[PDB]
Amino acid sequence: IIRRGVNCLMLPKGMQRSSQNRSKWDKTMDLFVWSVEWILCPMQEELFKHVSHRIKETDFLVQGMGKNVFQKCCEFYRETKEERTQILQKSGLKFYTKTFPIMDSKKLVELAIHEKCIGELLKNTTVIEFPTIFVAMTEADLPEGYEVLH
Amino acid sequence: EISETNTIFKLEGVSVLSPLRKKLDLVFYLSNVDGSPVITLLKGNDRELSIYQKNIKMASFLPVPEKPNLIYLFMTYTSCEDNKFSEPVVMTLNKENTLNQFKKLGLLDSNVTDFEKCVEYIRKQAILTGFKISNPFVNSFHLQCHRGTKEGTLYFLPDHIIFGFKKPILLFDASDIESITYSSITRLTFNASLVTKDGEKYEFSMIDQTEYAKIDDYV
């Protein structure tokens, strides 16, 4: 099913992921909101995953992170949304979602988080239920099996 | 083979003590070969043990003597992959961790603090994997005792008795219990002996006397 441009693959409901999707159209706010799966890749020589809910389609990507998730970036690397949002922008963290031609993928595309809102970053893509979004200082750190396309 | 698209349930970080000692991940998923459900334990993407479906005979959440941040999931089975093991699956979930993990999966909100919410969820995914996990300490009871020289926990459930968890782990279906005969050693402590319909005797010694009442009542 296709919400707000985004092409969304829907798993059978029994599936854990299906129950971890809360992406919906939100009446009062008058827009679409988005669960994303954050996967933080720290600096190797162990992952931290977190799923945020009700992120506003009209928000830059850093804007809809989440305290805990920031905190956790702040420990893998180096406090109101205002600042948090501001400290990740001058940060050097690259952000990769994954890319598709039902089937999982290990092909990633880096995305230009500061030059677009989530809704635009997602418009003509595919997600499995809802975006997964990898975070790392370098590619080396992304999980093994995962390969980025430039 | 297994990923987010055929994974029924996935909990990282369980402390498997039988049929092996190791920190593992617990996973229910439907095989992409034939749509069939499977229980596996993973090390990253190793599979130390997989059970396919029938196969699981009995499974249950059990408390950990004297340790409430902790909980056993106990599962018995007719067979597994390569017959690598035979002994029952005992593992130990941490409560607090379980909650925070359910939270980091977005399965439960920041505020929720009742573990039985996790438990509800595990029991349900399990039914989706062709099997029941009972939860009889939410009328059951357990006590300490010894077999020969080894201490263990004797748990008394509605339809089973389990003696755990040093190898060999015993399970007795209640309907297989011909008799339990009692025997004093002190005013403070006694021995109980189970007798199976096929004549095997199992001498559960050194039970505290305060437990006597609960055992008679059970029969």
Is the domain of B14 the same as that of B62?
yes
* Contact residues, A window 23-82, toward B, CB-based 8 Å cutoff: 35, 48-53
Please state the φ and ψ torsions of residue B158, each to the nearest 5 degrees.
-60, -40
Element at B12 (helix H, strand E)? strand B7-18
Domain C-terminal end among B138, B160, B177: B138
For B124, name the nearest residue in chain A, comparing CA atoms only.
Answer: A14
A14/B contact by beta carbon, under 8 A: yes
Helix (H, G, I), strand (E, B), or coil: what is residue A52?
Answer: strand
Domain C-terminal end among B138, B164, B180: B138
How far apart (Å, rounded) are the C-alpha atoms in residues A32 and A104?
24
Is the domain of B54 the same as that of B147?
no
Domain ranges of chain A: 2-148
Is the domain of B98 the same as that of B204?
no
Is the domain of B181 the same as that of B208?
yes
For A13, name the nearest residue in chain B, comparing CA atoms only.
Answer: B8
Q: Report chain A's terminal Cα–Cα distance, integer Å.
A: 28
Is the domain of B128 the same as that of B164?
no
Helix (H, G, I), strand (E, B), or coil: what is residue B37?
Answer: strand
Measure CB to CB from residue A128 to each of B5, B10, B107 and give the nearest one.
B5
**Could you tell me the two tokens for A150?**
């430039």
Domain C-terminal end among B80, B111, B138: B138
How far apart (Å, rounded) are the C-alpha atoms in residues A108 and A126?
12
Cα dihedral: B3, B5, B9, B10 (round 10) = 30
Report CA B174 to chain centroid distance, whole Å. Answer: 17
Element at B151 (helix H, strand E)? strand B150-156
- A148: Cα within 13 Å, side-chain hemisphere: 18
Element at B216 (helix H, strand E)? helix B212-218
**Could you tell me the two tokens for A53?**
């809910």
Q: Are A134 and A108 in contact (CB under 8 A)?
A: yes
Give CB contacts under 8 A, 24+ apart, made by B179-184: B180/B215, B180/B219, B182/B212, B182/B215, B182/B216
β partners of residue B26: B11, B41
Residue A96 burial by Cβ neighbours in a 10 Å radius (0-12, 13-18, 19+)? buried
Q: Tell me how many domains chain B contains.
A: 2
**Could you tell me the two tokens for B67?**
């340790």
Name the method of structure determination: X-ray
Element at B124 (helix H, strand E)? helix B116-127
Helix (H, G, I), strand (E, B), or coil: what is residue A94?
Answer: strand
Is the domain of B108 the same as that of B185?
no
Closest CA to A55 of A123, A135, A126, A117: A117
**Could you tell me the two tokens for A25?**
């159209």
Is the domain of B118 the same as that of B205?
no
Closest CA to A20 of B35, B4, B189: B4
Is the domain of B85 the same as that of B1?
yes
Sort out which chain B residues have CB atoms less than 8 A from A50's CB and list them: 104, 106
How far apart (Å, rounded) are the C-alpha atoms in residues B177 and A38?
53
**Could you tell me the two tokens for A15?**
């599936």
Helix (H, G, I), strand (E, B), or coil: what is residue B102?
Answer: helix
Host domain of residue B63: 1-138
Sort out which chain A residues have CB atoms less than 8 A from B9's CB and list them: 16
Is the domain of B42 the same as that of B89?
yes
Is the domain of B56 the same as that of B146?
no
For B2, name the nearest residue in chain A, comparing CA atoms only.
Answer: A104
Is the domain of B131 the same as that of B154?
no
Q: Are A66 and A49 in contact (CB under 8 A)?
A: no
Task: Say which CATH topology domain A2-148 has.
Answer: Ubiquitin-like (UB roll) (3.10.20)
Strands, E assignment, chain A: 2-3, 6-9, 24-26, 31-40, 48-56, 94-98, 107-110, 126-128, 132-136, 147-148
